[PDB]
Ligand binder design. Sequence first.
Ligand SMILES: [Ca+2]
Ligand SMILES: [Cl-]
Ligand SMILES: [Cl-]
Length: 162
Amino acid sequence: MNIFEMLRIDEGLRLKIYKDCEGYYTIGIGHLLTKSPDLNAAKSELDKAIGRNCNGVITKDEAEKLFNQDVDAAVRGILRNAKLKPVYDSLDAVRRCAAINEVFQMGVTGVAGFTNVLRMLQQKRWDEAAVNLAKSRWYNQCPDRAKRVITTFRTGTWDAYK
Ligand SMILES: [Ca+2]
Ligand SMILES: [Cl-]
Ligand SMILES: [Cl-]
């Protein structure tokens, strides 16, 4: 198991423009196209992201490319955010992967907004952190692909992906 295989499990590999479990226009392996309600935007965002005229469909090679870019962006997002970086760096290796996953799904701003969760994770209060993370829109709308991430913060093992 690793962060890539973890996110492939949580996000799947879709080659067609779909609305994800949070209701957003999406493609590949959990690549968020736009927070706009417009479908045109999704398509013009996809062409922008790929560098060719798609038409709302991509290759597995292209999905894997966006996916690497997106994992790379989640890690850089954490490291450049003053609230997340020290909490992240306090974490053991497996919890760090749950952290990357959470940001990949929800984005930096959303994740950094869980002030209490951050403090608890930093102090290694794993149960409290997990309890507080489950009190999110994310948890209610993508329950199976949120429960595994939260359980991972609780246990510090890969068992939920086994
Ligand atoms: Ca690291
Ligand atoms: Cl470790
Ligand atoms: Cl789900």
